[PDB]
Every structure is written in structure tokens, then in C-alpha cells.
Amino acid sequence: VDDHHHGPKQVMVLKVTEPFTYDLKEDKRMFHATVATETEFFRVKVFDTALKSKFIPRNIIAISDYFGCNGFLEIYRASCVSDVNVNPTMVISNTLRQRANATPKISYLFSQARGTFVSGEYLVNKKTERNKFIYYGIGDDTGKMEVVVYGRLTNVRCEPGSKLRLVCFELTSTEDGWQLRSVRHSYMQVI
Secondary structure, eight states, rough: OOOEEEEEEOOOOOEEEEEEEEHEEEEEEEEEEEESSSSSSEEEESSSSSGHHHHHHHEEEEOEEEEEETTTTEEEEGGGEEEEEOOOOOOOOOOOOHHHHHHHHHHHHHTSOOOOEEEEEEEEEEEEEETTTTEEEETTTTEEEEEOOOHHHGOOOOOOOOOEEEEEEEEEEEESSSEEEOOOTTTEOOO
16 A cells, blocks of 8 residues: 555466456456566565456566565556566576475464465365354364364365365464464365
């Protein structure tokens, strides 16, 4: 909103979600992308989904007039991005690639600040519903927690035994454990 940056930042697109409606009232659309310079990776929120044609994995692009908010890079207009032979010689080290695509271990999430936004792929082991919310027990070789889903994302067909890709969920805690709560910009799909 006031963390505005002129750019341009020159990045390779690593991964993208399909576009989706995050405000059902006015059919507002967005998608999520992970991108990288040669030394850093960035999580991007694209609110002009006309840009879907440019956030293709392995495309190299230049991002201008973007905003930093809550640890994301926000893009609001198609004019922010250009993609014609910006740096056909870009190399993304394999270490930076896997760092960009890594899922945090559940035990590591317990050490993190409540309210940070988390992305990760986890195995579901229990499903229960109550009062329009839906609670997914997830775990790994380090611990267990609940994914709390409410609203538009309750329509995602998911039962125990499925693997869940979570994008931009909020890390919270209660006296009974830790949770990843769906929020306005969240996205999820089963694999």
C-alpha cells in the first residue's frame, strides 16, 4: 500500500497456481506464483489474471511497480510485467530451486510466529466437519496439526489419504495445538 517498488525485478517463474475467485461477491480473481532471481525467491500475488499467459514455469519476466505486503510481492496490473528476451541466460541454482519449493516441517512451524503465512504440501489423516468449518488433521515425520477450512475452499473434494497443497494459509495456535487457517487469499488443491 506504501511499500511500493519501481522495479524492474528480473525473475524466472518457478511455479504457479491456476487462477481462482477470492472475492465471490465481485468475482475478483488472483493467482499465486513462486519466482526467483539468481540469489532469492519471492512469493507473488497476481491480482490481474490477464498475466496468466506470462507466469508460465521457466519463463523469464521483468516485474515493475509492485508492492510488498505481508511477505508477498503484489502485482495489480498487466502493465507491470514484460517477458521478451529479458535474460535468456538466467540460471537458478538447484539449491535455490529446492529452497523455493520446500515444504516446512510441522515441528519447524511450531517455532514460527503466529500469524505468518505458510505454504506446503502435507498428507491428510483425518477429516471432520462442524458448523460449516472443516478440520483436516495433517502430519509428517515431525508432528501433527489441523488445517481449518471455512468458506469457498470447503468445496475442494478431499478425504483422508489425499495429499494437500496449501498456499497462503495463516499459522495460528490455540491451547489445543497449532492450526493453518484458510484466509482471504488462500488456495488449496489435492494432488
